[PDB]
Amino acid sequence: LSGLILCPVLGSIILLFIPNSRIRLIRLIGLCASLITFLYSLVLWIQFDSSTAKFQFVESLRWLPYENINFYLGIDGISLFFVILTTFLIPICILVGWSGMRSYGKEYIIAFLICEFLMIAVFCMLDLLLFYVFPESVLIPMFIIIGVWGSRQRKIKAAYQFFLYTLLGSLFMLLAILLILFQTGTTDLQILLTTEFSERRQIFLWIAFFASFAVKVPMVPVHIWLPEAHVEAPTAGSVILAGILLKFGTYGFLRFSIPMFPEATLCFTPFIYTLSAIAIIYTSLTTLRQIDLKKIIAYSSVAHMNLVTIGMFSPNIQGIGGSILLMLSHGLVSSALFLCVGVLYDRHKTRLVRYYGGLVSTMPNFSTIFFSFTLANMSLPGTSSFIGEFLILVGAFQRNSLVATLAALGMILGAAYSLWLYNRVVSGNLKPDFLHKFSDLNGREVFIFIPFLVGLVWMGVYPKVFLDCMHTSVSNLVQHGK
Amino acid sequence: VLNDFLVRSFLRFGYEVSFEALDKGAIEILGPYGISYTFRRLAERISQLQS
């Protein structure tokens, strides 16, 4: 990993010295740098050994001498394919932008502000202080991606009181991170694993992490930032948001909640149970109220992510496997649906949803692919999302199956409204006022669709290569939770 | 059963959107709450100029 780690930063910076009004070169070379960092992510996958509690390719550089809070970079188990999904998806955003001129949307600026692999950092960052810096850090890139080239639906903004609470929750986690950091000098995640805290304080520290996380996670009391953040997000800002920025909260719980505070997690199991359950119920019923397509997909994403939560709780190896594989399948499916709804916007240039009609005439291949992914967002058994969600379900393994009975409503209403909305979008010869402008999909368009469908099917028919490469790590996490 | 679903959908809209408005109204009120306390204390502070 030593050299092949910093591909996106090197690429971005050495392209910053190429303003190059003639876009062809910046597009080509940024895309090549992204694709080669993805290639090195994938060869790093191939490099994996599914047999160690240690982290696969550890590296560091002194960051502050005393207590050495340094860039500790591990990729065991989950992070392995989290960074893989990150890379998998970043060329997708670079490729959804072969727009010809791309002038006001200055192409090199979006290249340089999507080609920041701080997501790679955080998923490999294995000392929760610097790990803290990155999800909060990616907000500066996310904010510029969300509105600079993002569609303007309102005076671009986020609920100000909610945003203040969201960042306050993030900084509340920071106080908890410091309390553990000075609690026993424990710099990094290996030693924060080894150490043992006061049960009276483990619960406080757990909920303090949980503040920021359950903001990043879309739980019922605070999740509103996803719809408002997406309906304004650009086509490639949503692909990243759904893809990774939601995985942030669940991976945070996975690494720095379950094997960190085993007693606090034991104590708060019913809390997250009910939270995620009622969140899934709400976000299943809501798309009744929401007619906005981006809000629809964002709420389906909330549902899936709170399923990821209702599964990560468990010492069930199947439980957390279903959690992380619902994460992978979600970063595939919701991002593929955001790709879909972005194509559906642009090809129609309209931001009402009642206006997407006669799709089987305009773009019938888009109808086929939109089904190929909406069956997934409802988790058709056979798809990747099915393996994910059902290992989430069997996560009631040592349990007594009372939260699966709330996932009942959460997923039945989800699949129901998934089908309702796929109909509502493709229904009828509802002639729109587009002046016979059909907008058939592009070869590059079906290309950027290719990898999501491929990952989806390759998981849904063969989840081994992902459950393997993971079981050793998750099982170590579980025994530390034992 | 369909009478049940209609009455239950109406009640569901009621409960959920009611608590939604409850949240939002609590936020709206609790803003100017601190605003006006802070301004009253600052008003004492600026009457210190000419007490």
Binding site: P270, Y273, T274, I278, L402, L406 | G14, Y15, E16
Partner: peptide
């Protein structure tokens, strides 16, 4: 109703607790 689900959710939690008391 929303507060009803909020309290019945922790009631299902308590049901898990009663199952824990079953053994």
């Amino acid at each position: 109703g929303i507060f009803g689900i909020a309290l019945p959710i922790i009631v299902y939690k308590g049901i898990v607790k009663d199952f824990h008391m079953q053994d």
